[PDB]
Subunit: 100 residues, 10 copies
């Protein structure tokens, strides 16, 4: 079963996705209306095989080159932390919350 999901990433804020079973599918990554035409890199934080957490790069954006990146159903087992590694933002993210 699935539910919509979305988050807005602003510079220096982490977006925590944890649930208090589940999986999280990432669809699109899009720059906001006010974002600066600078490089925007979006980082995701969740643990790897060997038990420890890590940061991965989902997408590298730029308004005048590539505003939106589609991941195709990138899923990560919660908890996951979404953040901008560089770039004012905002940067939108969407996908689905897969449950049960």
């Amino acid at each position: 079963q699935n539910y919509l999901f979305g988050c807005e990433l602003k510079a220096d804020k982490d977006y925590h996705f944890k649930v208090d079973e589940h999986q999280l599918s990432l669809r699109t990554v899009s720059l906001g209306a006010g974002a600066k035409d600078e490089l925007h890199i979006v980082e995701a934080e969740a643990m790897n095989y060997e038990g420890s957490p890590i940061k991965v790069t989902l997408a590298t954006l730029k308004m005048s080159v590539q505003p939106t990146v589609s991941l195709g159903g990138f899923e990560i087992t919660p908890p996951v932390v979404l953040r901008l590694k560089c770039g004012s933002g905002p940067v939108h993210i969407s996908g689905q919350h897969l449950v049960a």
Copy 2:
């Protein structure tokens, strides 16, 4: 069983997808032939796990950089509302209507 689904969006229109075992899977978001070269942002509204409806960003389009965005089958459980978060319009949305 899927059937073609489609909707055209533009300023002051909310396409309301409602059903009254039904799934709406989105494929493409493409700017209409009319569209000015301004930044378009398409968002979808629908419930999250907790039951509350969240506004979410499907994509950010701009005629001269990226007129179309492929979502690759983004499923959302109706009811769901689509619209332009900002941009004269028009913007086309394609996809499948999945049943039972």
Copy 3:
């Protein structure tokens, strides 16, 4: 079971896809060396849930911007028609012919 599928669209010549279950899965929609650097809109007409047929826009292409658009398997149940809403192509469409 799959069979390669592809067609070419121009400014005037609709491609009809019928058989005599069967499924048509669209892959990528590209621009032909011929085509001008003008806005191309590939649309598809098929049946919706209320039995009536409808027109949906698969993609919007522009040679000097986005020559190729990929749909990652947009499945449509036949019959379906593939036409060029605007632009004159040649415009190529690949995909699979899924069967019973």
Copy 4:
């Protein structure tokens, strides 16, 4: 079962995928280092449903516009031929070898 696959093509060199259940799932198509900034139409030839051999376009690429098209799992039943409808090449095709 899957194994990496890949091939390279330039202007008049076709490539032949063939074994002697089996499927070729194409992933990404991308211009390699020495490609001239000319148009690049990459195509495949394989059997359609009616039995004959059809030529189909996988992507239209241009080094300064779209150096890479991603088909994301486009499955074609061997035997299949890969070639440049036109363009000096090289053109890097990556994908998978799926087995019974």
Copy 5:
């Protein structure tokens, strides 16, 4: 079962993925903060159907044109090596670690 995966490749630096069913599903290939606006080719090395190892191109990137390529779940069987055939990045690679 899935775990989050994320290498970082630089000019003559090589990433080495391996275990001790286990599958590797790549998601996005993208440029990082540094990376001068020069061509970029990311190639992968994992075994092919027969037994010999192949070098394959995952994508051709360029900062001023296309900073990100979404392979959308390109699964490769371990062990596997990711490297830049051209360019010098950094170039980030996200994906999943599929197990059992």
Copy 6:
């Protein structure tokens, strides 16, 4: 003699170079920081030989294509009226006010 001269143009605002000997030498026509990514056509109106005033196009600009156009001393004898044939601006004009 040579004096500095500049103005601003925004549909909502026009310019009347009047000398109530003289010359108006135009240098650059450049898009203001807040201009939309729309098409801007700067127009100048003055006297031709035959005595009846005519409208002339000085430049055609687009922020993401060409923000500044240098006329390099396009001299015009007053009276003359600079104005935006289209685009809401603002467009800055710079140059010289030559005398005697």
Copy 7:
């Protein structure tokens, strides 16, 4: 002694500049708002040193790449014809009409 000089050119609409010393000094060639995004070539016709009349190319413009071009006072001796040897137009030509 100089006066403003303009003119709007379209396919099949040669512009004749005739003076019944006198010199025509071309300033800017700029695409009109209607002008499609197809290549445009503006040519001018005045007689050469050896008597016979030549056709010369002034500028090659294209809306999405270079909407305006500064000739910077390219002076021709009348009579002279300005035409659009390529493209629909409209194309604007500004400049000065110098007199003795």
Copy 8:
């Protein structure tokens, strides 16, 4: 009578060309290797006819669309200030310094 002139600009600093005949002839306006891809508006401040100082826009720049702008010898009379109206540079201004 000319001596090479030049100066660097950043949001931090201005430049004050004053001298105790003299003439300032500006040539090219260009972004430094360290300038970001933000919009850069360079302005000059010097007296007008009426005698009161005025701020004029010499050029709008953007690294990825128009790194350089050639003014072609825009002569201004000291004292003159050159500043970065918007953007942070560094931007370089070259030219000439003419004396009596």
Copy 9:
């Protein structure tokens, strides 16, 4: 005393400007209607201050980057040689044949 001057180039259609006081002022250098999107380079060969002929780059062109370049009245003393250092052509040269 000026008269129109024009040229056209390809790898085998060069142009010698010789005469039997006299002066060639080059204006624009632009690519022609059907020449390929490859780099283009125009060089002119004429004697230097020490009598020996030098080879000089008039401009570097590329249809989708910059099809036209204005030299702005670049004067050279016959005999002069115009050629396409590289690039397919056609490549048009305009300017004026000055005399006495």
Copy 10:
């Protein structure tokens, strides 16, 4: 009297121009056939009105953005130094040598 000027510039060279009256008028700065699509910055060195030599930026170049920049008769009192502040090259320069 004038003579053609020309020179190629590489990275960590220095092209000296001294005549042993005399003035150096610069025309077009253009990128060589094998320059990297990296950012180039051409510098010029000569005396300021106060005595000491000063470096100046003539033009910032980027192959896929601006391959050619036209200074349009930038006169410099030799001796003058012409170098590349940053860029592989080759970077061509053309102009005139004006004598006594």
